[PDB]
């Protein structure tokens, strides 16, 4: 038995179209902008820049360790060892995917502190740009507004070159000095 | 277009470091009140040690636009809403020193100087520089410390095989 | 030695009024600087001029009720010159040698009570020597089963 979603659509006999997934912002049916949470409320897609993601997972495993000990009653290279220890505590251990993920995240995160990831998240989610771009803008370090618009091609006409270049400056300024 | 682009270029930069020193102090302040238990002498040094670090970056952030900001020197004009309730404006726009300025005098008078002027003063500067040069002597002695560097007996199964069959 | 250095690193004390008043000192004298770092958060509202400025502004509940973007400046790059070039500024750099001197005087004082603080630790060096002079059962108590209190020693029947 495998996992299901909040997307209920009834594909009766009519198999296909399964139209390709590209950054023409045409992601899956599953990674659509209009999502639905377990409380039925229509809620927007949640995309994470690897740092926003690093923090989320760390937070979740930290809180899990709490309940695991409760139910039992009756510097980056330094973060890697610290995280690899938390994984030994909460995770199934067979889950090697999370181990690599956490290592990659620790080594590639642009913003260390939660405070930092807070401003990143503000500055960006005010552009009206779709969660995918807003994440790739947070996770890909670009200098020219062309570097950005080339790598994130979906952006193309969505933002001024200057407006994007102004953002790229105040993004570089937020980067935690590793 | 009516009114003006006044100042505040690096003002955002001051605010950020102004906040982090506020944020680290505030949190220590909140705990400081649960004197019921002090957080672990590790914990307080983690918060009060990066809380002091926060003010180094906030200390320096002030000098970096340090030409720019004392030059900007803005005094407030606003909505007259600011004029009612008064003081808040006196308070919020005021620079001073506290009871602080006083141990600043205790310190200033603790030095060996005060009213003797320019020629004797320039000389003291050269002398303090000589003290810093005698401090280089630390470089020489550090070289001496000279500490820098870089970081079956057999087959179990077969034994048993023998015991059972005489296969050797 | 380590245990005793760890003891001094446990904040630990049994003081009445002595211990009491001291911690109240921390509360108020720390709180002051906490509160004055809040004037620092008020310079934040002082920006105004931008939406991200409003965000910083709401930092005061009184900013929540003092709507205006209020303040404005001009140019005295000349006054920056005066700050830097004044004979007063040369002199003020003397206030730098002066406070720094008294800081070095403090430093000297702290440093000396440190070697005498290591001297109470020589009482312990002696205790370890006493133990060196003169069962390796390893136990843990105060329950929990992990961490808590853990130590080792012998016993009799066998």
């Amino acid at each position: 038995v495998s996992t299901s979603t909040f997307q209920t659509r009834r594909r009766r006999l009519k198999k296909v179209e399964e139209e390709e997934n590209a950054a023409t912002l045409q992601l899956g049916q599953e990674f659509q902008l209009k999502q639905i949470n377990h409380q039925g409320e229509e809620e927007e897609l949640i995309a994470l820049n690897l740092s926003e993601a690093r923090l989320v997972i760390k937070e979740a495993l930290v809180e899990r360790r709490r309940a695991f000990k409760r139910s039992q009653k009756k510097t980056r290279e330094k973060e890697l060892e610290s995280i690899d220890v938390l994984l030994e505590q909460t995770t199934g251990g067979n889950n090697k995917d999370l181990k690599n993920t956490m290592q990659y995240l620790t080594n590639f995160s642009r913003f260390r502190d939660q405070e930092t990831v807070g401003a990143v998240i503000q500055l960006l989610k005010s552009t009206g740009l779709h969660p995918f771009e807003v994440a790739q803008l947070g996770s890909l370090a670009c200098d020219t507004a062309d570097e950005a618009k080339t790598l994130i091609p979906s952006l193309n006409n969505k933002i001024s070159d200057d407006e994007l270049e102004r953002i790229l400056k105040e993004l570089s300024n937020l980067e935690t000095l590793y | 277009f009516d009114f003006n682009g006044v100042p505040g270029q690096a003002l955002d930069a001051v605010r950020m470091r102004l906040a982090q020193l506020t944020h680290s102090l505030r949190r220590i302040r909140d705990e400081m009140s649960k004197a019921e238990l002090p957080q672990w002498y590790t914990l307080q040094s983690q918060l009060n040690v990066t809380l002091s670090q926060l003010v180094s970056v906030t200390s320096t952030l002030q000098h970096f636009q340090e030409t720019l900001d004392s030059t900007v020197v803005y005094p407030l004009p606003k909505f007259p809403t600011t004029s009612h309730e008064s003081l808040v404006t006196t308070l919020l726009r005021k620079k001073n020193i506290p009871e602080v300025d006083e141990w600043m005098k205790y310190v200033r008078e603790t030095s060996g100087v005060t009213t003797a002027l320019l020629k004797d003063e320039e000389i003291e500067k050269l002398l303090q520089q000589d003290r810093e040069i005698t401090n280089w002597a630390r470089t020489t002695f550090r070289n001496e410390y000279g500490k820098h560097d870089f970081k079956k007996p057999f087959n179990v199964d077969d034994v048993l095989k023998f015991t059972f069959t005489g296969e050797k | 030695n380590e245990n005793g250095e760890t003891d001094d690193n446990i904040e630990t004390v049994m003081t009445q009024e002595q211990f009491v008043k001291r911690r109240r000192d921390m509360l108020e004298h720390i709180n002051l600087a906490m509160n004055e770092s809040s004037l620092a958060l008020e310079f934040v509202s002082l920006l105004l001029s931008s939406v991200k400025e409003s965000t910083g502004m709401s930092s005061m509940s009184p900013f929540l009720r003092k709507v205006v973007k209020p303040s404005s400046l001009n140019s005295d790059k000349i006054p920056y010159v005066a700050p830097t070039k004044k004979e007063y500024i040369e002199l003020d750099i003397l206030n730098k040698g002066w406070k720094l001197q008294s800081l070095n005087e403090s430093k000297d004082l702290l440093r000396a009570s440190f070697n005498k603080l290591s001297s109470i630790l020589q009482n312990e060096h002696d205790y370890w020597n006493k133990i060196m002079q003169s069962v390796i059962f390893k136990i843990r108590d105060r329950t929990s089963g992990q961490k808590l209190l853990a130590i080792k020693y012998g016993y009799e029947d066998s």
Partner: peptide, 25 residues
């Protein structure tokens, strides 16, 4: 996103920042 909300404390009862000497005509 530094923390969440911004810590009030606003104060006019503090030590004092103003002096006084031009009161006389």
């Amino acid at each position: 996103p530094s923390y969440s909300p911004t810590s009030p404390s606003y104060s006019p009862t503090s030590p004092s920042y103003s002096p006084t000497s031009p009161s006389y005509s």
